[PDB]
């Protein structure tokens, strides 16, 4: 997990939250084998968004490519624990939006946090997704961890290739969703990459 020094950042970092302020979670992977979370406040933009290696390699391969698209390899530097620390650090009695509530509930239960309260904004899967395009052409560059081919199955049978499902533009994309435009106020990072990512291969000397 985290260090002392990375503990005290991160509480520091996230009392940048508004504790009332409309707050959309959405998860990839499972919630017993997250990989990516995102929390994120509209009206002021901020976010928290970080990843986790999965432990049930079977099922996030199927995951890889049939949501998200992330290469297992890309998640071995990730920062570990942030998922636990995190939650345990978000305000009392929070309230969060969510497409689908059932996933974030198991998450929030299994970390001791039934105060916070979740509403599910249940909207159909294509109207939830009207503004992906938009979304993907503005924000892409918020999160580079899809690189894989993602395909899904049809309505009537066969499958597609379809843009990935990243968990930070899945919550920009369903406030669009929500208020009819893509005109969302700037998203900024809560967190350092610094404490998101380890430290990484040392750069080559070219
Ligand atoms: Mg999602
Ligand atoms: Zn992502």
Redesign the pocket.
């Known amino acids: 997990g985290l260090t002392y020094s990375q503990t005290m950042e991160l509480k520091d970092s996230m009392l940048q939250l508004d504790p009332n302020a409309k707050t959309w979670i ?3 992977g499972r919630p017993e084998d997250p990989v ?1 979370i995102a929390i994120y406040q509209p009206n002021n933009g901020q976010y928290i968004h970080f990843y986790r290696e999965p432990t049930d390699i079977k099922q996030f391969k199927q995951d890889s490519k049939h949501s ?1 698209g992330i290469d297992i390899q890309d998640l071995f530097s990730v920062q570990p624990g942030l998922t636990s620390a995190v939650i345990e650090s978000l305000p009392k009695n929070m309230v969060l939006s969510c ?1 689908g509530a059932d996933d974030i509930r198991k998450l929030l239960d299994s970390q001791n946090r039934r105060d916070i309260k979740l509403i599910d904004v249940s909207m159909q899967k294509d109207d939830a997704r009207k503004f992906e395009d938009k979304i993907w052409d503005e924000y892409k560059h918020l999160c580079r961890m899809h690189t894989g081919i993602v395909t899904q199955k049809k309505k009537r049978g066969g499958k597609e290739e379809v843009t990935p ?3 930070l533009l ?2 920009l994309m369903f406030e669009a969703a929500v208020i009819g435009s893509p005109q969302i106020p700037t998203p900024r990072p809560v967190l350092s990459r610094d404490l998101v990512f380890r430290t990484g291969p040392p750069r080559v000397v070219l």
Request: some cysteine; aromatic content about 0%; hydrophobic content about 20%.
């Open positions: 959405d998860i990839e990516e998200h497409q499902h990243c968990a899945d919550c």
